[PDB]
Amino acid sequence: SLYTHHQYIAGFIMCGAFAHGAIFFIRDYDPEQNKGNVLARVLDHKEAIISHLSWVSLFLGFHTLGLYVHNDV
Amino acid sequence: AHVVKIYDTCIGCTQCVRACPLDVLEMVPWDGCKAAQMASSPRTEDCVGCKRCETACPTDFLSVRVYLGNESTRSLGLAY
Amino acid sequence: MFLISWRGYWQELIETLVWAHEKTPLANLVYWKDKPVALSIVQARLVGLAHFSVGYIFTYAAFLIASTAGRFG
Amino acid sequence: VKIAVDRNPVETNFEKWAKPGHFSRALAKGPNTTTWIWNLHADAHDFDNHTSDLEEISRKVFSAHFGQLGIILIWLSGMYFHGARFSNYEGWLSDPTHIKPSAQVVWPIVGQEILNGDVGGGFQGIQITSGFFQLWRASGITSELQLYSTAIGGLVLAAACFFAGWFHYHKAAPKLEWFQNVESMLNHHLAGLLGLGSLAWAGHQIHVSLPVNKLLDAGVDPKEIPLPHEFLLNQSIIADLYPSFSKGLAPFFTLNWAEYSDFLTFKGGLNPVTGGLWLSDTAHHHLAIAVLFLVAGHQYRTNWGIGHSIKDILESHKGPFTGNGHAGLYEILTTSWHAQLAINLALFGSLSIIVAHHMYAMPPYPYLATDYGTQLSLFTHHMWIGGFCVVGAGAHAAIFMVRDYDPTNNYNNLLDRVIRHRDAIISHLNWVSIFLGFHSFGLYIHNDTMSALGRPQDMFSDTAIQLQPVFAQWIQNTHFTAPQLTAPNALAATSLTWGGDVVAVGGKVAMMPIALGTSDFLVHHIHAFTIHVTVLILLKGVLFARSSRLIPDKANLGFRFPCDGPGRGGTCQVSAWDHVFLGLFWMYNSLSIVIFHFSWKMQSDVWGTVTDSGVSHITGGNFAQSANTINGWLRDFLWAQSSQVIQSYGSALSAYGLMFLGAHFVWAFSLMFLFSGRGYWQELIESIVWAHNKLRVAPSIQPRALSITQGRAVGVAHYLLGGIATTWSFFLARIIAVG
Amino acid sequence: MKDFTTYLSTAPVVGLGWAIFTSGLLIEINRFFPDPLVFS
Amino acid sequence: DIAGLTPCSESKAYNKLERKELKVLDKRLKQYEPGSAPYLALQATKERTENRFKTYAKQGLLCGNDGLPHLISDPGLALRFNHAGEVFIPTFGFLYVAGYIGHVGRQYIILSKEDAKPTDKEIILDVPLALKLAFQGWAWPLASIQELRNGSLLEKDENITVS
Amino acid sequence: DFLVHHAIALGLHTTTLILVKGALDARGSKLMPDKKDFGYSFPCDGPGRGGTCDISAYDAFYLAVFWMLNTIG
Amino acid sequence: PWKQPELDPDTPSPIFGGSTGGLLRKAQVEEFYVITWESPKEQIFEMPTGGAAIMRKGPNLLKFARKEQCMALTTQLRSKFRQTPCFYRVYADGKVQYLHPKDGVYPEKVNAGRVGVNQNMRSIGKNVDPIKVVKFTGSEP
């Protein structure tokens, strides 16, 4: 119970950090003030980050499901 | 009680006016375009927020946007 | 329900119950203070996720405690 | 009335095979997005949208139907062929009870061969559950040579069917006048197809199905049987079996039909040997049925000028409360295909549901009741087919209201008056669903709560606050005591489900009386609740398809559209298409319960091995006590009968264990489509297009996310497939490994 | 015939020939040198 | 050995698993006659099973306490203890095949886009061109580093962005 | 234990991708160049442009919770 | 138009038996809408709420509870029968308002009298971020 309760809360708290991190970009983000800094340079090339993340999930998902199926059969 | 704003990129197609059922959009003369027409939104109190108009707009990006907001009896489409 | 079935099916249904409440001989004397309408789009995503997560927790908690308690090992 | 054809309308060539999308004006341009691909396979067979001409729509339909027959006939010939060359029919015919059927031998590759189980009869292969072996025995079939010919006939007739579709469309295609001769079609379909069709079958049963199954049931070996053709040639042979054949048609033309009492009978009940209906009774049935359809075919006045006129019959049945009634329907039915399709689907689906109930209680083909896997598979199949077909009526009726509805023809008509009190229909029907779900499903929760609290005396059960179905119980006895009074010439009753004694075959019971109690009261009501609601979703979509208070103009938007917009608080899933998409899940849920009811009831109260001291049912008769609680349906049905599927690894039933899991994967996979929306996906593809663009490897056909309507369709498809395939694995593995 | 070859060059047909090749090749590669796991 | 794993030849559970899987077939073989086809099918499966077990032992595999073979992934331990064919060598075999699919599809995309109506070339392929590229991709690594060192692999800020 | 750890990694990487996307694409997308003007949580931009249902950053958090529960499961 | 046409509350209605899509308690309490038009012959047309009805030669009048129900009918008459309808808004107090051809010319045709409303002189986009207006309402205005 203690291990499961902490693990389930961990995910809920972690989801809030991103979500409340997304609200910052809408409401409390000023591009002209934060120009050339790390925060704008991340937002500039986001197509690369989301692309690499997608590749990791696809490769991890295809291989993990495959090994499980190959052994099920 | 919705908000309807039209932007500088209108070209006087009139397709927004023909589409929206509730007669919330009309054409007004203007000197910015070839057609010498521009839209307008005088009566947004009758806007049901259907958003059909935006679909009619055939520009790269919409010269007409319906920013949803506070609701009302007319906006919710309540016959009762 | 809230995840699969959207709003438009329901608002047409509530319009039908409204007709009956007014045409009934005695119930029509009673009238709501606030008009009844179906739940919004974003509200249903939230509500259905709550009914979805609570079942995803109450089910396991019973299985976790009962499986481990009955065997005592 | 006359024949009317137009010669060589269409040239035959592969020019349009190279140009996909020719049928539509929008698609003939070509693809610039990948959405053009989905629209292609979707709008392919929507002939009403291609062109306004009703004539061309009729030519296309009448020729496409010739394709489904050819597709069926090679499928049917495949079963006959695969049963001839890769089966154990000749072995099963000599020992039906102990040997199991097998029409699908597998190849020897990695793994796989274990599926070729030890079926019996010097043969190993996949165990089938289609009942073909009992069908081929009901007819006179002893050898494999009779199955080979039967297969070659299907390929010959199928090519004729396919040839016909090219001929009736590309070369000589009928006119619209030929199609509107509806009165002519009814006489030919009733007398010719149903009448002579049944009269013909009687002939085969009388000359082959009776002279062969009599010897087989008397222990004679199949190889020693005289062949089906020889019986026709020698009037002495068949006379030894049925002496009435010596008189030869003189009894018929002299109107002394009592002489044919030997083979034309009204025995009723079942055969003690085979556990199936008396073959003599069926020849009597199909003979009777032919005379009934033959007179029916001489009703309409096609061209002779004598008979009824459909239009005069419809516009003459008028009433006060209805006003103008049934008037403008002959113009509807003769003009819209969707109207006829909706009516046909409603009865074609409700019939397959009747076939499912009238077969299990009245097993027609021999050695079917003892093959529990076969008897359970036919019921579950013909029932699912009925649910789909019924739901198609709600879809293919809403299309009529949107597309083929002209208010000019309908003024103060039946169709107009129904729309004008639609809010009363849906309102009164909403109250019933809430009434049922509370008083029916709430009873289940009451029993669960009472049991967990330690108050079993307060449950609804036999030892308890009994709610017994008196009306059903009275009907069982009435049909059981009918041979005495209401049907004196009947030797016995129609089935043993009403009442009587057990019929045992091979140590297994074929059928025995079914008792109805408190549980059978709750379930029968549970079905009504799931049926009244499934009607509410479809009927609401039909009446509110053309217009509503929320959206007074839906007909201009069309049949299938996702939503009018985020206004009015939200208008998503308001179309009639989205009502069908919802009715499917309910329809699937309703049909699934009507299947669990059949499995647990028949396992516990009916099926089982007969011993010297009574019968030992499979589940020990636990339907009465456990079914009243929902936990019983979780414990005694699911957590128990799932042992045969789970433990199937390492045996011939291993395929069901895989499909059992695979079906769960596809079911869940659907949830991605139903729960999410096309907005998140189209943005994700943009970040993917960047990488494909960065490397100069990008498609000229732009990638676009699945359409809202498609997303919903893709969900219910993968949803139903996973939900249905699970049972298909959870049943056949449970029942093939009997108990 | 020019249109027939064009029909055969569509996506559904070329994919059918690809599938028979790749599946036929793999099944044939399992039939001979049966059930491989380690590569020598 | 390594990681506390025994070789599959020396293991007892490995041979226990062989005697079990053969006993199932011998029991299944008793039902049928000697010269029948079901007998020939099961004897072949018996022959394959006996071959599967001895070949895995001969290949220096590592079996655990459960008796099933385990694979090792680090090339250092694989090469040191002679277990390279398991994972380390399967990785190069696949990458050559995966790269071949990429270098081929990338070339068909570029070349069809140099002509009129490239959209039609995707749904209606140019099979003579596709086979030409498919038999020219045997040396795909050479062309990649040729195209990387040249600079004609990647595009340079002529791509759409969103802000 | 090897396959279980790899399956987890797939869940953690994909869950971040669902969230990260809703954050970086919160300000704007090609389908909706100005999300920032509407807000964090809105229904959709309509059936136009092929369909815009579940674009907002709220709808990304909404979909991640399903994966979160799957990962912690 | 030249002048707003005042409402004639006593004109013949079409021949329609009735339905359940009619007016509810909201109409008597809050507001309702009525539409007028002039037909040259007797025809049949589809109602927004319910089924079919028969027009009458001369003026015709209906009562609806929503503006969309009225404009849905104008689009049908202007297209199918090529007529010129005009509809009003009636409150519970008896006040009347003339809505749709407010200038006499339909909105899809220009007229010199009209004045622009809610007209931003900028491109879509190209507007301040929400942070600049963080503590009052509106980024688009």
Ligand code: CLA
């Ligand atoms: C069984 C249910 C299920 C499954 C299998 C998936 C699978 C997947 N989801 Mg998902 N999801 C689900 C339910 C499911 N989801 C639910 C209920 C929700 C909430 C509504 C979500 C919400 C969600 C979001 C928001 C996102 C995903 C994403 C993904 C993908 C992540 C990348 C990956 O893992 O590579 C692949 C993983 C696999 C398991 C491969 C699946 C296909 C296998 C290999 C079958 C191979 C085909 C085979 C040849 C059969 C074909 C024959 C047939 C075509 C006839 C992935 C394919 C993320 C994504 O987009 O990825 C980038 C993403 O953003 N999901």
Ligand code: CLA
């Ligand atoms: C129609 C019948 C039915 C239905 C619809 C359900 C539905 C459900 N059951 Mg359930 N159950 C049933 C019958 C049914 N059950 C019966 C008859 C029994 C025995 C009496 C049980 C016993 C049971 C238990 C003990 C539990 C459930 C749970 C659940 C819920 C888990 C849902 C989910 O997505 O979690 C997530 C699904 C998964 C994580 C995958 C399922 C299990 C996989 C195989 C484990 C794989 C893990 C591993 C990492 C491999 C995956 C990696 C991958 C990349 C390959 C779910 C709503 C669970 C629950 O309460 O939810 C928390 C729970 O613990 N059921």
Ligand code: CLA
């Ligand atoms: C995809 C749809 C589908 C599929 C795959 C199957 C598959 C199967 N059916 Mg089935 N069937 C279906 C639809 C389907 N059916 C529908 C919708 C109905 C309702 C009419 C039936 C009625 C039906 C019956 C009554 C029987 C089967 C049987 C069978 C099984 C044997 C196959 C066979 O060749 O028997 C061939 C069937 C016969 C030789 C007898 C057919 C007698 C029927 C009553 C003829 C009626 C035809 C009539 C002109 C059409 C209806 C007229 C209209 C006015 C309603 C097989 C598993 C048989 C079986 O149980 O297998 C042991 C069986 O007796 N089917």
Ligand code: CLA
């Ligand atoms: C287990 C999940 C579930 C449940 C409980 C329901 C329940 C219901 N559905 Mg849904 N359905 C579901 C799944 C479910 N559905 C899903 C996933 C879908 C997606 C396809 C659908 C789609 C759907 C549609 C489209 C419709 C329904 C309809 C209905 C309602 C029918 C009326 C009725 O019988 O209510 C009776 C009440 C019950 C069945 C509740 C049983 C539990 C007990 C009786 C309640 C006990 C109350 C307690 C004593 C009070 C405690 C108070 C406390 C605060 C102290 C009902 C409330 C129909 C409807 O609403 O219109 C009539 C409607 O048309 N269903």
Ligand code: CLA
């Ligand atoms: C007879 C029934 C039938 C069926 C079942 C299909 C099925 C399919 N067609 Mg189609 N087609 C048909 C008839 C049919 N077609 C007819 C009558 C025509 C008119 C000539 C066409 C013309 C047509 C065109 C123009 C296209 C399709 C495409 C497709 C595929 C959709 C793309 C996709 O989802 O994968 C997506 C694929 C990827 C994301 C990567 C490619 C990897 C694929 C899956 C490998 C190849 C799969 C292979 C074809 C499967 C064997 C065939 C299968 C049906 C047994 C799909 C498998 C599209 C396609 O590209 O086909 C693949 C497409 O462009 N079809």
Ligand code: CLA
């Ligand atoms: C030549 C075709 C081609 C090429 C060169 C690439 C290349 C690439 N893709 Mg990709 N992709 C393709 C087709 C292709 N893709 C198709 C058809 C689809 C639709 C299913 C996708 C969907 C896709 C996704 C979702 C992602 C990539 C990603 C990537 C990048 C990482 C590799 C990867 O894991 O992708 C995944 C590989 C697949 C999904 C398998 C593709 C299906 C087959 C195997 C390839 C098609 C070959 C083609 C049909 C044959 C035509 C040959 C011609 C001569 C006829 C990489 C640069 C990832 C990325 O963004 O990089 C960071 C990523 O997330 N791709």
Ligand SMILES: CC1=C(/C=C/C(C)=C\C=C/C(C)=C/C=C/C=C(C)/C=C\C=C(C)\C=C\C2=C(C)CCCC2(C)C)C(C)(C)CCC1
């Ligand atoms: C000590 C030690 C060590 C070390 C370690 C290290 C050095 C590492 C780490 C670590 C880490 C690495 C951790 C972490 C964490 C992380 C996280 C948790 C994340 C994230 C973030 C987020 C999620 C957020 C986002 C955002 C947004 C989106 C908006 C803007 C802002 C913000 C930020 C809010 C080892 C073990 C090796 C060994 C032993 C000793």
Ligand SMILES: CC1=C(C/C=C(\C)CCC[C@H](C)CCC[C@H](C)CCCC(C)C)C(=O)c2ccccc2C1=O
């Ligand atoms: C059923 C349903 C409704 C209608 C549901 C309604 C009107 C039920 C809400 C009212 C009832 C009376 C509240 C029931 C009481 C709750 C059990 C307890 C609430 C406790 C709170 C006060 C905290 C929607 O509006 C809807 C909207 C969008 C997507 C899906 C749906 C949807 O599925």
Ligand code: SF4
């Ligand atoms: S729809 Fe757009 S382009 Fe056309 S007139 Fe209106 S604002 Fe101008």
Ligand code: SF4
């Ligand atoms: S929101 Fe709807 S009613 Fe309002 S102007 Fe736009 S399209 Fe017309």
Ligand code: SF4
């Ligand atoms: S289906 Fe999607 S786009 Fe249409 S109204 Fe609903 S949320 Fe908006």
